[PDB]
Write a protein that binds this ligand. Structure first.
Ligand SMILES: [Cl-]
Length: 295
């Protein structure tokens, strides 16, 4: 059911969503998205504790909601899909291809999962599972070439030859610690291609192969680096390996402020709890490998 003791109740508790406006509208969809991205980290720490990334919704629910963990796209967007459909939003799973700046190509594999939500004939893209400063704060209207300014950046969805492209126009980055000016976590482009996708409806079973591949292949960013990110009311926290970062959006002069701190092994556990509300049941081995990954 949907009352006391129910999974949907526990989901809303987990994301700190106490409102009950009692409308299936864009406002409610936006609220839920924002609450989720502030509470449920984009993270892959299981991989680096020697554990699996589970694809089943039962396992995902127990890990994210009951254990207060986060996850990658196949977990946190699958959870979101479940929540939105449970309350009655017409929601569709879509498969995506992630842009690689070094390669100047989108991934061959369908390595991202995002959502489409339809409300009164209007179509929106919703994604709580890409992370860092690539994370939308509001649903994006599915309108080819329209500029959609949000706090993180201006977003654009553009259609070309049956593919849809999510791009962003970022602010100037201000890095007050020059020792981190050339961090591998940073890139210097304002216009950034994020991912591509098609509107072809998918099921979770379409990502079975990719689920294994993404957590086992040396080519996967997910096995190269350990990371977690969480959105805040004014920016993003992201830990990559031993490097903790905090971005404050539009801090001053149309610029984002990025602060850096190198953590020791003893600090990792504390930061995970204090900043991300992540408590682990096996030891994390933080890793900062060489696969392209920016914040
Ligand atoms: Cl916004």
């Amino acid at each position: 059911g949907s009352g006391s003791g129910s999974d949907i109740e526990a989901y809303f508790e987990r994301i700190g969503y106490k409102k009950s406006r009692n409308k299936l509208d864009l406002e409610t969809l936006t609220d839920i998205l924002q609450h989720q991205i502030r509470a449920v980290p984009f993270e892959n720490l299981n991989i680096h504790c020697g554990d699996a990334m589970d694809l089943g919704l039962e396992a995902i629910f127990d890990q994210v909601v009951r254990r207060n963990r986060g996850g990658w796209x196949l977990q946190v967007n699958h959870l979101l899909y479940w929540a939105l459909t449970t309350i009655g939003f017409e929601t569709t799973m879509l498969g995506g291809y992630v842009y690689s700046t070094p390669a100047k190509k989108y991934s061959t594999g369908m390595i991202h999962l995002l959502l489409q939500v339809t409300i009164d004939g209007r179509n929106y893209i919703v994604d709580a599972g890409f992370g860092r400063s690539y994370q939308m704060w509001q649903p994006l209207e599915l309108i080819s070439g329209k500029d959609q300014p949000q706090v993180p950046c201006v977003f654009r969805l553009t259609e070309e030859n049956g593919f849809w492209y999510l791009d962003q126009i970022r602010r100037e980055q201000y890095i007050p610690n020059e020792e981190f000016l050339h961090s591998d976590l940073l890139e210097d482009s304002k216009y950034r291609k994020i991912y591509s996708f098609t509107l072809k409806p998918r099921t979770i079973e379409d990502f079975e192969s990719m689920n294994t591949y993404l957590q086992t292949s040396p080519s996967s960013v997910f096995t190269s680096k350990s990371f977690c990110s969480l959105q805040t009311p004014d920016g993003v926290h992201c830990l990559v390996g031993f490097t903790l970062t905090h971005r404050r959006f539009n801090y001053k002069d149309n610029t984002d402020l990025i602060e850096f701190k190198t953590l020791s092994e003893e600090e990792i556990e504390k930061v995970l709890k204090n900043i991300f509300n992540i408590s682990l049941q096996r030891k994390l081995v933080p890793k900062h490998g060489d696969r392209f990954f920016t914040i």
